[PDB]
Design a protein around this ligand. Structure first.
Ligand SMILES: *C(=O)[C@@H](NC(=O)[C@H](N)c1ccccc1)[C@@H]1N[C@@H](C(=O)O)C(C)(C)S1
Length: 260
């Protein structure tokens, strides 16, 4: 096609490996680039953990109000919000918001513990029809992003289809869906990623990720005004273990996608 030529040229100019999946819900048409290759999800897997807790709250009506202790031993590499409530408590709602909007790794580990381990997160993916998503580790070691390692990976095609069913489809309840959409719209980490390549008039809910090997990820659901929504997944990884993050590549991929 044409978008695929520019995405291929962008990837060639970056020195790394790019994965992109677009779903246009108007005709259920898809644009993919390496859409069936595995990529390290890094923190974009937090959307699946928050959605799995939300699915539990459909039965446990007061689940999101349940307090959870934050103890000093719970503290890991990056904890912007849970650092503030050490030796205190946080509800599951505020942990889900910390995980999605600030990418708090302690908050993610509390979501994983609430689901009974990483296998509880993968189980929820399979229950909604995602046979590709696999979460094996807690944070931060899920961000190792080793080339060829299948752990904590997915493909862009599967992630785009899953994010659509969670935020646009009916894989969740209506109250649960709207709460996740509200959370993703309030993300604070994605200004330089997919958001930077889209028209300002567009409202975006997204979750970013990053890890070793210069892994730089972003998944997003886009609402253009007067237009049916879109789902966009951009994954990027590099050959150097110490490589710097390349959020500019995700913006460029999004800009290429938005043009056509
Ligand atoms: C998931 O992607 C998380 N990433 C990490 O914990 C990495 N080990 C890390 C990379 C760089 C600096 C600190 C930790 C969290 N989500 C990232 C993101 O959304 O970009 C993060 C850097 C905010 S941490």
């Amino acid at each position: 096609s044409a978008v695929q030529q520019k995405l291929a040229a962008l990837e060639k100019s970056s020195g790394g490996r790019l994965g992109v999946a677009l779903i246009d819900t108007a005709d259920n048409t898809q644009v993919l680039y390496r859409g069936d290759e595995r990529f390290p999800m890094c923190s974009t897997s937090k959307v699946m953990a928050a959605a799995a807790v939300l699915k539990q709250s459909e039965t446990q009506k007061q689940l999101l109000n349940q307090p959870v202790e934050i103890k000093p031993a719970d503290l890991v590499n990056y904890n912007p919000i849970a650092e503030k409530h050490v030796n205190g408590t946080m509800t599951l709602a505020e942990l889900s918001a910390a995980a999605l909007q600030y990418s708090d790794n302690t908050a993610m580990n509390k979501l994983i513990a609430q689901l009974g381990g990483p296998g509880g997160v993968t189980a929820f993916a399979r229950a909604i029809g995602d046979e590709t998503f696999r979460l094996d580790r807690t944070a931060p070691t899920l961000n190792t992003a080793i080339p060829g390692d299948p752990r904590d990976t997915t493909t862009p095609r599967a992630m785009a289809q899953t994010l659509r069913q969670l935020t646009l489809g009916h894989a969740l309840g209506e109250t649960q869906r709207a709460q996740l959409v509200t959370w993703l719209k309030g993300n604070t980490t994605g200004a330089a990623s997919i958001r930077a390549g889209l028209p300002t008039s567009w409202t975006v809910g997204d979750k970013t990720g990053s890890g070793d090997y210069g892994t730089t990820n972003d998944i997003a659901v886009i609402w253009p005004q007067g237009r049916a929504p879109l789902v966009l997944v951009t994954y990027f990884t590099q050959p150097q273990q110490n490589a710097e993050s390349r959020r500019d590549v995700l913006a460029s991929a999004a800009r290429i996608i938005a043009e056509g």
